Amino acid sequence: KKLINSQISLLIGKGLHEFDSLRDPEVNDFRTKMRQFCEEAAAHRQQLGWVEWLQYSFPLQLEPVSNRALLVNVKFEGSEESFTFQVSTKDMPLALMACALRKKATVQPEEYALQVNGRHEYLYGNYPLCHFQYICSCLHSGLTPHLTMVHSSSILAMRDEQSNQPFSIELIVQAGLFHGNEMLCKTDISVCDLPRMARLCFALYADCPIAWANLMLFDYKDQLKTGERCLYMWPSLLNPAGTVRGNPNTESAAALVIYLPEVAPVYFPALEKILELEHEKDLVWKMRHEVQEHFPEALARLLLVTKWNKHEDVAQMLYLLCSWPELPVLSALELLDFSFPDCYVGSFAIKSLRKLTDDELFQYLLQLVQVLKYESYLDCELTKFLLGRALANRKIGHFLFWHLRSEMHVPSVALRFGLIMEAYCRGSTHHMKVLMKQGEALSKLKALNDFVKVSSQKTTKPQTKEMMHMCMRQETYMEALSHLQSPLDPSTLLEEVCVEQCTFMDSKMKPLWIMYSSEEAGSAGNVGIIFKNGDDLRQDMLTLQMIQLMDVLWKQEGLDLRMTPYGCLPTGDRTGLIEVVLHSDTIANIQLTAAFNKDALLNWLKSKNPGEALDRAIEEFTLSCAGYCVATYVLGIGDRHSDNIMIRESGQLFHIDFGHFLGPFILTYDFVHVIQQGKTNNSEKFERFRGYCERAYTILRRHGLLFLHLFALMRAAGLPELSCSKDIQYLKDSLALGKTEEEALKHFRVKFNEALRES
Numbered sequence: 001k002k003l004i005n006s007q008i009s010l011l012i013g014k015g016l017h018e019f020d021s022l023r024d025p026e027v028n029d030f031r032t033k034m035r036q037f038c039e040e041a042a043a044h045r046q047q048l049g050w051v052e053w054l055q056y057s058f059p060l061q062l063e064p065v066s067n068r069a070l071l072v073n074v075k076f077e078g079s080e081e082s083f084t085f086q087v088s089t090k091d092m093p094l095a096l097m098a099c100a101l102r103k104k105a106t107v108q109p110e111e112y113a114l115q116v117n118g119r120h121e122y123l124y125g126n127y128p129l130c131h132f133q134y135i136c137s138c139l140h141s142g143l144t145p146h147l148t149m150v151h152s153s154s155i156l157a158m159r160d161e162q163s164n165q166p167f168s169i170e171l172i173v174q175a176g177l178f179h180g181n182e183m184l185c186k187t188d189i190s191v192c193d194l195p196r197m198a199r200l201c202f203a204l205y206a207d208c209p210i211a212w213a214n215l216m217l218f219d220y221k222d223q224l225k226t227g228e229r230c231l232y233m234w235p236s237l238l239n240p241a242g243t244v245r246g247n248p249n250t251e252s253a254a255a256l257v258i259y260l261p262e263v264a265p266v267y268f269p270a271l272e273k274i275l276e277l278e279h280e281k282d283l284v285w286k287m288r289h290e291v292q293e294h295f296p297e298a299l300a301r302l303l304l305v306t307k308w309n310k311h312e313d314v315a316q317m318l319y320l321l322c323s324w325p326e327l328p329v330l331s332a333l334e335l336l337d338f339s340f341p342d343c344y345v346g347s348f349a350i351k352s353l354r355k356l357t358d359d360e361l362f363q364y365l366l367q368l369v370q371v372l373k374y375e376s377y378l379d380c381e382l383t384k385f386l387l388g389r390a391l392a393n394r395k396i397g398h399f400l401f402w403h404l405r406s407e408m409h410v411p412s413v414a415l416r417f418g419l420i421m422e423a424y425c426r427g428s429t430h431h432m433k434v435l436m437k438q439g440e441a442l443s444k445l446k447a448l449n450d451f452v453k454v455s456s457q458k459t460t461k462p463q464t465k466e467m468m469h470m471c472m473r474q475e476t477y478m479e480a481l482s483h484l485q486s487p488l489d490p491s492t493l494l495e496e497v498c499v500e501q502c503t504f505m506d507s508k509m510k511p512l513w514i515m516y517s518s519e520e521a522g523s524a525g526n527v528g529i530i531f532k533n534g535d536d537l538r539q540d541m542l543t544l545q546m547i548q549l550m551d552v553l554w555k556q557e558g559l560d561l562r563m564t565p566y567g568c569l570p571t572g573d574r575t576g577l578i579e580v581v582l583h584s585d586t587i588a589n590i591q592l593t594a595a596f597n598k599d600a601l602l603n604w605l606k607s608k609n610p611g612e613a614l615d616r617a618i619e620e621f622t623l624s625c626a627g628y629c630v631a632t633y634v635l636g637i638g639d640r641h642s643d644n645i646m647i648r649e650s651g652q653l654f655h656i657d658f659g660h661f662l663g664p665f666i667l668t669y670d671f672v673h674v675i676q677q678g679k680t681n682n683s684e685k686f687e688r689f690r691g692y693c694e695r696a697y698t699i700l701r702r703h704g705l706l707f708l709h710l711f712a713l714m715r716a717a718g719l720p721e722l723s724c725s726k727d728i729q730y731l732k733d734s735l736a737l738g739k740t741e742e743e744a745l746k747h748f749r750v751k752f753n754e755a756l757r758e759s
């Protein structure tokens with residue numbers, strides 16, 4: 001009744017009064033309508049069935065002839081006593097639950113769910129036990145799974161307690177009219193001709209650019225803007241992609257007072273009113289009905305040919321779009337680009353993305369948050385979609401919050417991002433409290449890192465480590481750093497902080513290595529996190545999400561290349577978290593017993609995998625080496641050394657620290673020796689690896705457009721190595737999109753020979 005308003009303010013890092021002090025009708029209208037939208041979603045959520053609630057709160061953690069049957073440990077809610085019994089690998093959770101209730105009575109299964117001990121996870125649904133991530137990881141590490149039988153009533157109890165004339169302007173400076181990236185007229189247009197998404201872009205210069213400012217010609221209520229407007233500029237020539245809202249720093253920002261002449265109130269024609277009304281481009285526009293009927297996927301090309309300045313062509317295009325059938329995910333993601341800015345085009349693109357699954361949405365969520373930067377008005381279809389999907393799934397809501405929270409320091413998005421988070425919080429009061437615990441933990445991690453930064457300059461490395469340990473052992477710090485959901489994976493619980501296992505890197509920004517343990521979770525609760533303050537993790541997150549996509553796409557064609565796309569999450573201004581892949585070490589640390597460096601990797605794997613286990617480790621290495629050889633070549637991952645390439649004790653080879661991408665790969669004889677089983681020349685084993693590399697490269701080539709589309713949507717992020725058209729050009733060259741399957745295979749073989757030649 002009083003705290004919520006201050007709770008949101010502390011969580012978002014901005015006071016709610018700052019939105020009210022703006023005296024903006026658009027801001028207030030978004031706040032009232034989205035609060036209503038999010039509260040209704042929260043009400044529907046409180047009436048869900050116990051499994052439907054689990055599908056929201058604990059979404060299934062799944063993996064992307066037998067012969068097998070493995071052991072399991074099961075306990076109940078009240079009693080501490082556990083029952084150990086062997087079950088089948090093919091068996092479903094209901095079979096385990098029925099077996100658990102039989103052993104309980106001696107010492108109905110449909111009314112239960114299997115809680116994963118010391119983890120924010122549940123084992124439910126019609127899936128074989130081996131398909132669940134927890135059981136699979138337990139099987140691949142020789143661990144006994146610990147589960148708890150939780151009755152339907154208990155899940156509902158948890159659900160209940162977690163409730164809530166030519167255009168003219170008087171310049172009182174370069175002016176230009178835009179409908180996205182293309183000029184509507186000269187830097188020459190009628191008022192009736194003006195489209196709904198028309199932008200008036202300014203540039204103040206002396207050659208030396210000073211500042212820029214953009215504005216919408218129509219308001220959020222569809223009415224044409226009149227008359228006087230003070231434009232607070234952003235520092236810089238003409239920038240149409242930039243935000244339509246002024247600089248919040250009114251004290252130092254240069255302004256631009258302009259007057260919009262009163263032509264008559266004039267509102268843009270409504271839906272029903274619209275419905276009534278070089279040589280290649282003209283031919284495509286002529287065949288607009290044939291494209292609507294026979295080629296629906298060619299909509300993007302049809303929107304690029306239509307005259308956005310001519311109002312007759314726009315209304316003609318809109319009627320075709322109003323009757324246009326549903327388009328695939330790939331085509332819909334292409335339409336969210338700044339080249340297609342029309343509101344009705346955006347609404348059609350969102351409706352085509354309603355068929356996305358929670359897992360599909362999660363993969364593109366990073367790009368969807370980036371599209372919000374291109375949005376002109378606060379109340380848009382993308383915001384309604386993201387909020388609605390985040391309210392339906394707690395894991396989606398988690399990452400949507402963190403993706404917006406990490407950009408709060410940026411003034412251009414702080415208002416939009418802060419309002420969406422406030423709306424989400426009105427929808428989920430309990431999850432808001434859960435995220436506050438994560439925010440308070442990161443607050444103490446920042447303070448601890450600041451302390452380590454100062455202490456390192458004053459004393460030696462082991463003295464700074466004991467200094468770090470004393471700071472952690474503080475009552476407030478121990479409570480804040482412990483018993484929370486992992487921001488990198490909400491399914492993982494960060495229980496007891498292991499102060500003695502915690503350390504720092506003696507280099508520039510001094511990153512922290514934080515270790516955790518869990519009595520309840522056992523060995524699964526042993527988790528590590530790298531906290532980085534001062535280094536930017538946006539480029540690292542993108543590269544890892546692309547490697548994850550590569551892995552997903554390969555698996556969709558039946559190819560498992562045993563990749564390691566570990567979690568990376570920026571949380572604030574040059575602040576973020578990295579997931580520690582335990583039981584893994586760098587090539588450099590392994591090199592620091594092999595007589596020669598070419599034998600180092602195999603010798604290390606021999607000691608970790610003795611006997612028959614070695615053959616699997618060699619296969620794990622070969623598949624992962626092939627996967628990363630293609631991944632590093634395609635994405636253009638440079639600055640590669642022995643300290644940024646890691647290997648798991650199980651065999652898997654993986655890359656770390658992605659500071660430079662998009663402009664050849666690392667194929668050292670250290671890798672070849674493991675692939676060839678230790679033999680000087682093993683053609684059979686190397687040609688299979690070459691074959692696996694060729695297969696990996698060809699599967700990505702067919703999905704080349706998807707990589708290009710996602711990299712095009714990531715131009716909004718403001719990445720230094722991904723901002724212009726020439727940056728994405730590396731993917732066109734590396735994947736060889738113009739070439740055919742055999743033309744690119746010969747090109748890749750020369751590059752494969754080149755990486756092996758210079759070794």
Ligand SMILES: C[C@H]1Cc2ccccc2N1C(=O)Cc1nc(N2CCOCC2)cc(=O)[nH]1
Pocket residue numbers: 503504505511512513530566578579580581582584646656657658
């Ligand atoms: C060099 C290691 C040891 C260490 C100790 C304290 C703080 C940071 C770090 N480290 C790093 O920051 C390196 C580093 N490690 C990374 N890893 C992610 C995969 O799991 C293993 C760790 C990813 C990455 O991008 N950089």
